């Protein structure tokens, strides 16, 4: 439907800037495997309710597919397919031995108890075992899922497999007690910080004391601001939640901001900070802007008023292509949406390697490897940007699709 068709259109506009055969493009349009299963569970009242589960493996040319699991009641097969297609490019732009995967269940978990959630996870694993595995398909954290759900899923997969192989490696995002890896919580934020640092280095901007404006103050936004001020030493001037936002030229420490949000339910009315809306934060003149909220915050209506030199979009496409072009012609170095939030998938890959090899790393080693991976990926995208005279998002799409197409050619899937 709409999401899958929009993803296909994105793939088309990406391909029309690179030399790819038509048959390979057609192969990339259609995902390899779609698995729609019935997930039966018994509720606390004793009645048996069955939900609809989707597992979409878009491609596995580069390696075993990787993909998050979303227990959203509005999840659709088209949405899962589009998300798997996006995951393919997200894992390809970072040079991981992964294909694109995605999972979901049509269910609202707000009405499910802990026992019901455990039963749902266990039954979903029982249903999708034959099309997943450590070397076939790796489920991952996503919207409305917490690491305890993945703990239950890994337990069920280990029970079914009879512990023949590396069960811990079947899924990622597991609790640190069993097969977990450090830096999982700050993964996306740390990747965003590394991308911002690389963008500043490319532009020659020294970030000591510079200005960062972050829209959306979830866990990802708070970690982004905190790690920015810690490593990059930048001055946070404005942070906003889903309700409102605050502004302070002096500098905001995210610790007390998160404390205020936890106490009063929002970051509004911060001591010494002027209360402003999302639009004022977006239009605020800063050195770098980071949208970490619900997607489609920057559109062609409000693109010409953006003044930040670097835009790092953490969310899944919060800036429209028209706004992308407007920012590009304004001399603003943007960051692709799937490139910025690729820290989470990179750290999930790290955890998968830790589980597969049976050796677990420390915070420092994971951070250094993530730094290297993000630096290399961003530099590759920037080199493609400079050479092809195209957009950052288009450059990342070209890199990802070129890698996937080369993998398909090497496997013999496509002869041209
Ligand atoms: N996405 C992720 O990967 C992620 C994110 C955060 C944490 N974690 C992991 O999970 C652990 C933290 O636990 P959690 O995030 O699963 O949440 P949790 O500790 O399971 O939260 C307990 C639940 O009870 C409610 N609650 C909490 N305090 C309460 C109080 N004082 N009075 C009444 N109700 C209360 C909350 O409802 P409300 O939700 O309505 O407040 C919450 O959903 C951490 O160790 C971390 O590693 C993972």
Swiss-Prot record:
EC number: 1.4.1.3
NADP is among the record's keywords: yes
Annotated residues for binding of NAD(+): 216-222
Segments crossing the lipid bilayer: none
InterPro entries per UniProt: Aminoacid_DH-like_N_sf, GLPV_dehydrogenases, Glu/Leu/Phe/Val/Trp_DH, Glu/Leu/Phe/Val/Trp_DH_C, Glu/Leu/Phe/Val/Trp_DH_dimer, Glu/Leu/Phe/Val_DH_AS, Glu_DH, NAD(P)-bd_dom_sf
Gene Ontology molecular function: any one: glutamate dehydrogenase (NAD+) activity
Pfam annotation, one family: ELFV_dehydrog
CDD domains assigned: NAD_bind_1_Glu_DH
GO biological process: glutamate catabolic process
Reactions catalysed, as given in the entry: L-glutamate + NAD(+) + H2O = 2-oxoglutarate + NH4(+) + NADH + H(+); L-glutamate + NADP(+) + H2O = 2-oxoglutarate + NH4(+) + NADPH + H(+)
SMART domains: ELFV_dehydrog
UniProtKB keywords: NAD, NADP, Oxidoreductase
Top EC category: oxidoreductase
Quaternary organization: Homohexamer.
Family designation: Belongs to the Glu/Leu/Phe/Val dehydrogenases family.
NCBIfam families: GdhA_Arch
Record's protein name: Glutamate dehydrogenase
Underlying gene: gdhA
């Amino acid at each position: 439907i709409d999401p899958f068709e929009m993803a296909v259109k994105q793939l088309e506009r990406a391909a029309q800037y690179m030399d790819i055969s038509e048959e390979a493009l057609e192969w990339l349009k259609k995902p390899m495997r779609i698995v729609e299963v019935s997930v039966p569970i018994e509720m606390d009242d004793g009645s048996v309710k069955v939900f609809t589960g989707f597992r979409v493996q878009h491609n596995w040319a580069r390696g075993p597919t990787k993909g998050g699991i979303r227990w959203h009641p509005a999840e659709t097969l088209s949405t899962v397919k589009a998300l798997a297609t996006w995951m393919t490019w997200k894992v390809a732009v970072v040079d991981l031995p992964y294909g694109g995967g995605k999972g979901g269940i049509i269910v609202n978990p707000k009405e499910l108890s802990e026992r019901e959630q455990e039963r749902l996870a266990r039954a979903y694993i029982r249903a999708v075992y034959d099309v997943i595995g450590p070397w076939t398909d790796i489920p991952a954290p996503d919207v409305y899922t917490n690491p305890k759900i993945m703990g239950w899923m890994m337990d069920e997969y280990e029970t079914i497999m009879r512990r023949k192989g590396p069960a811990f490696g079947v899924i990622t995002g597991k609790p640190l007690s069993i097969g977990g890896s450090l830096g999982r919580g700050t993964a996306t934020a740390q990747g965003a910080i590394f991308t911002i640092r690389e963008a500043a280095k490319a532009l020659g901007i020294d970030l000591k004391g510079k200005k960062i404006a972050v829209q959306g103050y979830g866990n990802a936004g708070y970690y982004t601001a905190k790690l920015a001020k810690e490593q990059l030493g930048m001055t946070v001037v404005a942070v906003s939640d889903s309700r409102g936002g605050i502004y302070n030229p002096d500098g905001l420490d995210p610790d007390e901001v998160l404390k205020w949000k936890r106490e009063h339910g929002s970051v509004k009315d911060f001591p010494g900070a002027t209360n402003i809306t999302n639009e004022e934060l977006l239009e605020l003149e800063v050195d770098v802007l980071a949208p970490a909220a619900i997607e489609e915050v920057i559109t062609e209506k409000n693109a010409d008023n953006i003044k930040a030199k670097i835009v790092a979009e953490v969310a899944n496409g919060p800036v429209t292509p028209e706004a992308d072009d407007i920012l590009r012609e304004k001399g603003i170095l943007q960051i692709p949406d799937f490139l910025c939030n690729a820290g989470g998938v990179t750290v999930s890959y790290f955890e998968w390697v830790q589980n597969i090899n049976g050796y677990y790393w420390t915070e420092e080693e994971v951070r250094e490897k993530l730094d290297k991976k993000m630096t290399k990926a961003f530099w590759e995208v920037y080199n493609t940007h400079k050479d092809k005279n195209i957009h950052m998002r288009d450059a990342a799409y070209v890199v990802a699709v070129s890698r996937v197409y080369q993998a398909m050619k090497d496997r013999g899937w496509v002869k041209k």
